[PDB]
Design an enzyme around this catalytic site. Structure first.
Site, PDB file in Angstrom:
ATOM      1  N   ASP A 164       8.205   0.876 -20.050  1.00  0.00           N
ATOM      2  CA  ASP A 164       7.029   0.816 -20.939  1.00  0.00           C
ATOM      3  C   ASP A 164       6.395   2.157 -21.313  1.00  0.00           C
ATOM      4  OD1 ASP A 164       5.719   1.617 -18.539  1.00  0.00           O
ATOM      5  OD2 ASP A 164       4.272  -0.045 -18.742  1.00  0.00           O
TER       6      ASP A 164
ATOM      7  N   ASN B 114       0.280   4.284 -11.270  1.00  0.00           N
ATOM      8  CA  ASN B 114       0.779   4.181 -12.663  1.00  0.00           C
ATOM      9  C   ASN B 114      -0.120   4.761 -13.714  1.00  0.00           C
ATOM     10  OD1 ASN B 114       0.993   2.120 -15.266  1.00  0.00           O
ATOM     11  ND2 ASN B 114       3.013   2.717 -14.289  1.00  0.00           N
TER      12      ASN B 114
ATOM     13  N   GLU C 131       7.220   2.723  -1.481  1.00  0.00           N
ATOM     14  CA  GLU C 131       6.974   3.262  -2.822  1.00  0.00           C
ATOM     15  C   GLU C 131       7.512   4.671  -3.009  1.00  0.00           C
ATOM     16  OE1 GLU C 131       5.910   1.780  -5.588  1.00  0.00           O
ATOM     17  OE2 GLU C 131       4.518   0.346  -4.813  1.00  0.00           O
TER      18      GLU C 131
ATOM     19  N   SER D 161       5.196   4.282 -19.198  1.00  0.00           N
ATOM     20  CA  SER D 161       4.329   4.729 -18.090  1.00  0.00           C
ATOM     21  C   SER D 161       5.201   5.365 -16.992  1.00  0.00           C
ATOM     22  CB  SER D 161       3.481   3.622 -17.506  1.00  0.00           C
ATOM     23  OG  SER D 161       4.303   2.757 -16.725  1.00  0.00           O
TER      24      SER D 161
ATOM     25  N   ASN E 254       8.794   4.446 -16.217  1.00  0.00           N
ATOM     26  CA  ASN E 254       9.017   3.014 -16.527  1.00  0.00           C
ATOM     27  C   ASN E 254       9.411   2.762 -17.978  1.00  0.00           C
ATOM     28  OD1 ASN E 254       6.366   2.821 -14.413  1.00  0.00           O
ATOM     29  ND2 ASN E 254       8.306   1.819 -13.811  1.00  0.00           N
TER      30      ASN E 254
ATOM     31  N   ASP F 102       5.011   6.393 -12.625  1.00  0.00           N
ATOM     32  CA  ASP F 102       4.416   6.205 -11.294  1.00  0.00           C
ATOM     33  C   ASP F 102       4.383   7.592 -10.609  1.00  0.00           C
ATOM     34  OD1 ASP F 102       4.166   3.404 -11.868  1.00  0.00           O
ATOM     35  OD2 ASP F 102       6.070   3.116 -11.020  1.00  0.00           O
TER      36      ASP F 102
END
Length: 129
Positions: free
Chosen positions: A48, A59, A35, A50, A46, A52
């Site tokens: 969308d 998230n 990750e 969002s 992201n 991380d």
């Protein structure tokens, strides 16, 4: 901070991550590796809206507040910037809260992809933990 693999294994083990909600330590070192490459400052935005955050790439749509994510719930009750410190305490507390949900550690795509069903002994090899 960019953690050394064994330095991270020791910090996770000291924080009670070994066996948390049934997830042995190698699971947590494998996930961190894929990750974020052990970088507490890693960020990934992201499609969308969002983002991380941190070593565990948590998230912003469900767990932390970054103030720019639509339909965000902040279940860990923190600011997402607290997930980027060299000190892992708040990241560990929130990761512990994430794995209590029904999907468990399957919540992390990197775990599903590179750690699930694999031999994870190499991740803790030579750490003396």
């Amino acid at each position: 901070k960019v953690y050394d693999r064994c330095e991270l294994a020791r910090a996770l083990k000291a924080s009670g991550m070994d066996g948390y909600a049934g997830n042995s330590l190698p699971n947590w070192v494998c996930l961190s590796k894929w990750e974020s490459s052990y970088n507490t400052q890693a960020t990934n935005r992201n499609t969308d809206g969002s983002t991380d955050y941190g070593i565990f790439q948590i998230n912003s749509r469900y767990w932390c507040d970054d103030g720019r994510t639509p339909g965000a719930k902040n279940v860990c009750g923190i600011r997402c910037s607290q997930l980027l410190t060299d000190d892992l305490t708040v990241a560990i507390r929130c990761a512990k809260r994430v794995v209590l949900d029904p999907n468990g550690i399957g919540a992390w795509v990197a775990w599903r992809l590179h750690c699930q069903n694999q031999d994870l002994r190499s991740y803790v090899a030579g750490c003396g933990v």
